[PDB]
Amino acid sequence: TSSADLTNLKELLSLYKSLRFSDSVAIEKYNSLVEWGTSTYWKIGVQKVTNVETSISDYYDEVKNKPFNIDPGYYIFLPVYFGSVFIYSKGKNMVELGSGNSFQIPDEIRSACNKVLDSDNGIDFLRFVLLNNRWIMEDAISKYQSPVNIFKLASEYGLNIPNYLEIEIEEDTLFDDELYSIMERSFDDTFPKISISYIKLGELKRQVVDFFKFSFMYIESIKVDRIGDNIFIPSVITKSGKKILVKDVDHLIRSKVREHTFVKVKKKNTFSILYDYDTRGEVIKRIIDTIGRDYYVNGKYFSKVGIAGLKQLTNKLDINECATVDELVDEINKSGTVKRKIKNQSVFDLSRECLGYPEADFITLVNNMRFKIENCKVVNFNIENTNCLNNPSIETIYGNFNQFVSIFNTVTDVKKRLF
Amino acid sequence: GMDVRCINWFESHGENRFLYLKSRCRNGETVFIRFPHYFYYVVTDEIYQSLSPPPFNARPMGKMRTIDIDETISYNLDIKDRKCSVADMWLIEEPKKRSIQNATMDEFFNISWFYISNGISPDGCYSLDEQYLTKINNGCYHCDDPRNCFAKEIPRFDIPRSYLFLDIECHFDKKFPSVFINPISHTSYCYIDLSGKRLLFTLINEEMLTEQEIQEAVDRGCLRIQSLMEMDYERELVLCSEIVLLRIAKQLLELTFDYVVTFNGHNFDLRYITNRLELLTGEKIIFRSPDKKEAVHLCIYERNQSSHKGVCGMANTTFHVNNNNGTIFFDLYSFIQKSEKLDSYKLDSISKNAFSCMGKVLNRGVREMTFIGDDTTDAKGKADTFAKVLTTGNYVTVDEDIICKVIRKDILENGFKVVLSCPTLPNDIYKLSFGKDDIDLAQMYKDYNLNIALDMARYCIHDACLCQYLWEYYGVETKTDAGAATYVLPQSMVFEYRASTIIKGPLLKLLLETKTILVRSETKQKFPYEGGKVFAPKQKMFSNNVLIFDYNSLYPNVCIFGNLSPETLVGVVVSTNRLEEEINNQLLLQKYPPPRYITVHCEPRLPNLISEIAIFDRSIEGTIPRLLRTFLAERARYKKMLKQATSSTEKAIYDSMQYTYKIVANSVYGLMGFRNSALYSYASAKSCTSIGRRMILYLESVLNGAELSNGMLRFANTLSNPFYMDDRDINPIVKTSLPIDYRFRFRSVYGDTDSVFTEIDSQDVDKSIEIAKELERLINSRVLFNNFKIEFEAVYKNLIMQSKKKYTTMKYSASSNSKSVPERINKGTSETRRDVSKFHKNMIKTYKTRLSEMLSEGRMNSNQVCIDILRSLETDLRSEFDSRSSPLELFMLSRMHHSNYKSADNPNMYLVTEYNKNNPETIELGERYYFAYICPANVPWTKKLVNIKTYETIIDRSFKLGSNQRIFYEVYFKRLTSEIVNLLDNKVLCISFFQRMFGSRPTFY
Amino acid sequence: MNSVTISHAPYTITYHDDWEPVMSQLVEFYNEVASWLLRDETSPIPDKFFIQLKQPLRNKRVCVCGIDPYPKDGTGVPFESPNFTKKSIKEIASSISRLTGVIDYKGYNLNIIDGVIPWNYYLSCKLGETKSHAIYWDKISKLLLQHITKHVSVLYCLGKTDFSNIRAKLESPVTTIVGYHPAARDHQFEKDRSFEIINVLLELDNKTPINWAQGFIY
DNA sequence: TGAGATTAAGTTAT
DNA sequence: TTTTTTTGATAACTTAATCTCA
Ligand SMILES: Nc1ccn([C@H]2C[C@H](O)[C@@H](COP(=O)(O)OP(=O)(O)OP(=O)(O)O)O2)c(=O)n1
Ligand SMILES: [Ca+2]
Ligand SMILES: [Ca+2]
Ligand SMILES: [Ca+2]
């Protein structure tokens, strides 16, 4: 009867159209709207969904690994960066394709995914891939505007643009491996590539084609490589001297490479990629035994337990070196941004983030422990449920608990002065 | 003017709406009073001044404070106080509906606004002055200032009342009368005027009789009238035509009665007589406004109620009469259905349950038996009620199995002397009741004659007077007056609203007295929370005395003690890990000391978090504690009134009223935890439940393993407060007034949400009773604290704890001795459930009694008792399957019809729906019906019961199974067999026996 | 497309095949009332009672329900008369013209728009006096509306208090929309922008939109 | 084709 | 010749249908 219910039903339908790419907030809003509609109007054609299954392969055709003839039209060829794809509808942080759980992101790329995302409404979602602490975009589903326009907007916003081509001649072209190699060489793209996709006017579903070879040769051993601030990655090394790409620790766990054996790794014109298809729970234990006790896997990467002090806090707070508490609190009070950030965040959360501990594992370790706290400061602790001390990562984390509690005490007694 | 006592309040629904009051004077004059009708709004002074169209009227409400009652989750100790704004408020009256956007207190009614604003009680008597009253009509006055007119109050005085108890009887052919083909046959009236003269008269349609029949009737002493003019209400039997009968009914209904009472008359009787009136001659029943301006026609309208769970469906239908003259039309069917919980709600069942007595055999005969009843056979007052109903009764039920016609009746000054036509019976004391009769109405309608017509007239007048008997037995007038006084509502709808509405009157009174307004902005979110605690029973058979200790009004008292109100909730402090939990607990231990604040540790509302503490302030009393305190005071007053009653009817009425007030308090608490309510508070409900759980746990811990020796009683634990330290003695050794020669040990075995069962190693009823009284006195004086009080209910003998909520025992009350007769009580067993069986109840009663006797005499040395039980069970089952002598009434089940189903195509529906589509009678959305399991007669014993719950058919009053249909005895036997085997100790024998004729594995609790 | 036999004056029932589970009960609800109904003259033509029961039903998506025909004059189908001087049809026409932006129109005959069939709750009335035949049509209207709404996505009704017990009259849940004619509301039906509501409800149920432009005469 | 776990509905105690 | 007001909670058991692995 009124307009509020009309607007509510309109927005319910609008969010019902975009359901494949959504998060928990969208799902609960949809459920609330469905309940309200089925209560007010006594019947609604749609029901409540709780699977929250993410599927983007429906927007793409089958993978092409054989020579084929392209159709007449305009072509905008672009490559795809190898790694896990993080799709993102709108208004939140990026979620993971096929997992549903979202991922915390830096505020800069958060600002980018707020501003350049969906210029008005054209793009359903931007496909972001994270590789070696590098967040870069790839082909995205477009319905109203062209992907070239989105690329131009991102370029004028300073985003990292993949090399894009412009092909208009057709001449009944046959796409073969030679053409793919020539195009890849033309694009340079020292970053690893796994496949390409082209943009055609009219058609909505995109086409993905990849050319490579199996080349089942060998594997020799593994090693660790540094990326940034306490960021380590595993790389497999062979007898030739080159390394095969590893997307994450999950890939190594699935491939369960242990010694110099015969495993399937695909070879391309530039790099090589481990097999994506495949004891069990002890692979991580064997890996940590082979690589060193002073290591632990967190999130998508590795990390090393070191010495935590004023240096880590200053690095995480984006400030210079600090010696005494007086000048430290003076510098904290000098900058409004830092003080507002430390006010908006809890002591425990920032103290954990300074040491780069995992989110869930650290919470479980704390929940399986006992502490004694006086004057809002923790000084003694112990572990009650030792049965949880089977994962080597949690033991490595517990090995630095003294440094963690020292950081916690320092944060508490400086925030007491900062009020 | 002068002294006038109010009777009813009613509104006018015309163009210019008015509010009317009907009153009576001391002499007996009816006076109607008219007031203008307004729409009431509450605004702020700024909004009042910003209203560009000046309001018609406005009053200064005064300075009031508005409080936001939203609840937020706090992860730290930085809690911001609630937004309280003090302003000046205006109560404006508008003759039309205005749409002020910033209006507060929008949940109350205009009629309630008038009542509280003018300081006028809905029921009472006032000395009205004539300066504010203008004589509009002869007997109708107008008052433009009801605030000043009703300023004088006087003590209550009794006034005469007019009653019309009516009952019609129609002639049906197949199974139900129709207004288009089936005409009315009898119409019985019990008419009471303002002079106190009671007249009973039945009208018989002469159109159904021939000339010879009319001549015989007029010779026998029946007055035949030809027109409405000559009709006089002095002959108990009047013959007339249908048109004259309908006109007499119209002129009786159009009169300014005080009460027009019928049983299921709004849906059937009034509708039938109206439709007949507008079909035969086409004239309407006209109701006129007291000022003679608005005239309406009678039209029954339907009101539907919705449940608050699931799809919320539809679960109740009621029918009402529209009239603008102050007369109250009452239907006892809806009142009885809503107030009392019984297997069936038919008139015969209600009469059988209500009117019963114990008769002593006086004489015998070849076919007649003489009974006598007085105060010496049954309780005081039962005999008088039986004699009063016997004045018009015709049939009596003996042993709830034999229906016998009354041959001769004699009403004595102290009881009755009834002669019954029943076969000779042994013993000397029997049970008499006024229930079902053994006459089929359709057959006697098919052969209408003189004697049949007179007998049916007698039955109709019996029904008409039975309406009055049920009106007096249920105390409808007293309940109506009390409800009007308490809920602040007109007498016409006191029983028309549920808990969420009846408390709005007192809520508005309290809010205006405290000058408080409560508002909410954020959307309310619903979360599950835990409830009461039930202890698992330690045994199944006791053969020992068990004492029961129960808290008094546990949850309202918890709310009063903790001051749990939505506007007094400081905040909720929650933790995700143990560092934060320890830090915030240490901070909270000192930030909010508990002489004034209270902190309740609840289960976390989210799986992420591990702790949750809700903080409440006990410095200023909340709204919910005050409402609960008022309701508790009313309940205590009516319980005190109950304690001073001698007759059975007074005791029953007062017990029902105090039970209603207890239910009202419980429902107020539940509304505190109801999301759709305006008093929703998740933290308050959680805190109340948690406090109750800790209280019952504390009581059980203290009582369990406690023994008394010499003059001292030793409690298991220290008498320490489970919430915060108190300045009380915590020693568990207490002086005991019992003699030194007493030594017993107590072991807590069971508990339910406020009740604790203590097992005592004693069998003397008197000693156990006095020890229980001593225990309850001690645990009220020392164990409990503040407003928490406990009581000793009764002592249980031969307790059989079947499950965690089911038990059968014999109860000796607090005021009882060993020689006193114990009362067999059941809680949750298959004797109180309405959907098990009648045969199953008898079998389980007999077998439980036999097992109890065997255990008492000393048995269970081996499986001999199990062998005997199995042999008896098999013999009885085989005999009852082969004989097939039990009637269908022993295998009938009852269920309630509704539409609150999560699945649209529920198997429960499509059974009532198909019944309604193939029968003229209709099962309403709250009607209780009957069903039974049936199958074709040519079906042998089935050991694999598959495709069941589809064989059940609805059994109405007129249902006789044919030779091709039979009762599905397997379903009843399987449920009965599974219950008995659970009471035994042998397993392999029970499983092997069960597996034989039932292809399934037994389930053991 | 055949007919049924009733021992009463009309004896003219347009019985379509799709309406098979109606007549076998409808006569039982009408035989006992027709004799008493025909003794009094009625505003609709007595020979015109069942005229909307011949059209196919598995085509429509939304049905508009009227409580009773006009007190004076009647063509059977709701909101159809060559007079164009009323209170309900004129404001509905004005609202639909504002919605669709069409000014020139002569005749609506809403029965002709595909996907919509008008419905009257009570199938008869009296000259001048309205709502005087509820008893004659209660059960018949209940059964007819249950059958109608059994195979319709959304039901549209006019009136708030008039259509108040509809949630209990029919058992199977269905999307029901109730209107609000002005009466004393001072042209409040203009605020009742329910056509867009039913259109977007059909949109949510992946149904073809109903266009308010097929039923026009020029 | 059996056991076993799950879900919906009904009833009572509190 | 057609219009304002509704709506307590959780816990524990039995019986039955329906889907999945073996
Ligand atoms: N229908 C009910 C019955 C009970 N309770 C809750 C609140 C009561 O405080 C508690 C105990 O139930 P009782 O039946 O013992 O009721 P009271 O303790 O309030 O009453 P009494 O004065 O008879 O002891 O259970 C409830 O919420 N709803
Ligand atoms: Ca009767
Ligand atoms: Ca009757
Ligand atoms: Ca109690």
Side-chain angles (χ1 to χ4, degrees), chain B residues 401 837-840 842-843 876-892 961 965-969 972-973 976:
Chain B
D401 274 329
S837 284
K838 173 68 53 186
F839 160 80
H840 171 110
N842 301 323
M843 285 276 282
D876 290 17
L877 261 61
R878 189 55 61 194
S879 74
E880 277 142 352
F881 192 85
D882 284 335
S883 63
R884 279 190 178 81
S885 51
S886 291
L888 184 80
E889 287 90 53
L890 299 202
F891 294 81
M892 288 178 82
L961 57 91
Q965 295 189 14
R966 75 171 184 88
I967 311 173
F968 205 76
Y969 284 99
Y972 303 91
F973 285 160
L976 175 66

Side-chain angles (χ1 to χ4, degrees), chain C residues 33-166:
Chain C
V33 185
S35 306
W36 294 92
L37 176 56
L38 295 155
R39 73 174 167 80
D40 191 11
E41 58 93 18
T42 180
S43 181
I45 297 89
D47 201 77
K48 179 254 298 171
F49 283 161
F50 304 147
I51 57 161
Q52 279 187 208
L53 282 72
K54 56 191 179 71
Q55 305 175 179
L57 195 145
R58 45 191 72 246
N59 174 39
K60 281 86 183 175
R61 284 159 256 147
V62 59
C63 300
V64 57
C65 188
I67 186 67
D68 52 2
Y70 298 116
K72 300 297 289 185
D73 183 76
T75 73
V77 292
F79 320 108
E80 169 171 317
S81 72
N83 289 320
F84 302 85
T85 174
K86 283 171 184 65
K87 186 51 188 296
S88 294
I89 185 171
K90 298 288 94 176
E91 186 173 1
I92 294 162
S94 67
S95 292
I96 210 66
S97 64
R98 201 262 302 276
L99 182 61
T100 199
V102 171
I103 316 295
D104 179 32
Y105 63 91
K106 287 183 178 68
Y108 268 33
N109 50 232
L110 192 150
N111 197 7
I112 207 67
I113 296 90
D114 206 354
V116 190
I117 171 164
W119 197 244
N120 271 318
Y121 196 51
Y122 302 140
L123 265 56
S124 293
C125 187
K126 206 192 288 183
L127 281 183
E129 175 62 34
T130 178
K131 207 187 283 186
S132 56
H133 294 268
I135 55 162
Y136 289 148
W137 287 110
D138 179 74
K139 45 192 183 293
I140 299 154
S141 73
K142 187 186 292 292
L143 188 153
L144 283 198
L145 189 56
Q146 282 194 355
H147 182 231
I148 287 291
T149 197
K150 192 57 63 67
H151 308 286
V152 176
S153 65
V154 61
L155 166 67
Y156 184 38
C157 297
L158 297 173
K160 188 178 188 296
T161 59
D162 207 354
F163 284 84
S164 176
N165 297 125
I166 192 63

Side-chain angles (χ1 to χ4, degrees), chain B residues 68-76 78-82 520-525 527 566 569-574 605 612-615 681-683:
Chain B
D68 188 23
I69 58 185
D70 269 323
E71 168 191 355
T72 189
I73 282 180
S74 173
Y75 291 84
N76 265 306
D78 287 329
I79 311 169
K80 301 286 104 177
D81 45 345
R82 291 179 186 273
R520 61 175 68 251
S521 55
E522 309 192 314
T523 305
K524 303 171 285 293
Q525 193 172 3
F527 281 141
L569 162 76
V570 175
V572 186
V573 175
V574 289
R605 78 189 64 184
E612 175 165 346
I613 306 174
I615 317 165
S681 199
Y682 180 60

Side-chain angles (χ1 to χ4, degrees), chain A residues 77-247:
Chain A
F77 274 95
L78 59 93
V80 169
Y81 298 81
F82 160 73
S84 71
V85 187
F86 275 90
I87 73 152
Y88 173 67
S89 184
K90 50 190 270 181
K92 272 78 71 178
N93 45 2
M94 279 77 79
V95 302
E96 162 64 25
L97 196 149
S99 288
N101 296 115
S102 193
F103 201 66
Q104 188 67 278
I105 57 170
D107 290 331
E108 183 67 29
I109 71 168
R110 193 259 304 162
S111 297
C113 83
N114 284 136
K115 194 261 181 184
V116 70
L117 179 77
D118 312 341
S119 57
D120 45 353
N121 47 5
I123 292 278
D124 293 336
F125 42 82
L126 267 72
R127 285 174 63 98
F128 278 111
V129 60
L130 168 63
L131 190 60
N132 310 329
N133 288 118
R134 276 311 293 281
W135 293 82
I136 193 163
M137 71 183 184
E138 66 197 19
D139 164 70
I141 306 299
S142 71
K143 297 194 289 185
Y144 308 136
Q145 285 82 18
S146 68
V148 190
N149 198 1
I150 319 297
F151 284 167
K152 288 299 181 288
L153 269 293
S155 69
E156 85 178 6
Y157 205 56
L159 282 188
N160 52 3
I161 317 296
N163 279 112
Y164 83 111
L165 214 49
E166 286 180 349
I167 312 289
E168 199 173 3
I169 184 68
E170 172 51 51
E171 60 93 24
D172 200 73
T173 312
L174 274 296
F175 208 98
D176 216 344
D177 56 356
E178 298 97 3
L179 178 56
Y180 182 86
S181 67
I182 289 300
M183 172 266 312
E184 289 279 69
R185 282 319 294 129
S186 85
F187 285 169
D188 279 314
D189 276 328
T190 50
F191 296 92
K193 297 301 185 165
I194 193 164
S195 188
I196 61 163
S197 179
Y198 59 87
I199 296 311
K200 176 63 71 67
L201 59 89
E203 279 86 359
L204 273 300
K205 176 172 76 174
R206 281 91 178 95
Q207 282 75 237
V208 179
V209 56
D210 44 349
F211 287 152
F212 55 91
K213 78 194 308 294
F214 290 89
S215 181
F216 187 103
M217 294 295 174
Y218 206 56
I219 198 62
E220 270 283 332
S221 63
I222 66 165
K223 74 196 150 176
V224 60
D225 191 76
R226 186 181 176 180
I227 287 177
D229 276 27
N230 208 1
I231 293 145
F232 286 156
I233 46 158
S235 65
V236 288
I237 181 70
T238 179
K239 70 176 81 68
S240 73
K242 67 180 71 63
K243 55 183 182 292
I244 296 92
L245 300 160
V246 187
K247 53 169 74 175

Side-chain angles (χ1 to χ4, degrees), chain B residues 520-552:
Chain B
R520 61 175 68 251
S521 55
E522 309 192 314
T523 305
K524 303 171 285 293
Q525 193 172 3
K526 188 67 174 71
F527 281 141
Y529 67 104
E530 185 178 1
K533 181 167 185 60
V534 191
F535 304 137
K538 312 202 160 136
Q539 289 180 353
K540 195 164 185 174
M541 297 280 178
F542 290 84
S543 78
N544 215 357
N545 269 14
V546 168
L547 303 173
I548 296 89
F549 295 99
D550 215 358
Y551 280 117
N552 261 337

Side-chain angles (χ1 to χ4, degrees), chain A residues 357-368:
Chain A
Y357 279 168
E359 300 93 6
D361 293 20
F362 194 45
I363 287 308
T364 54
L365 169 72
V366 159
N367 278 342
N368 287 302

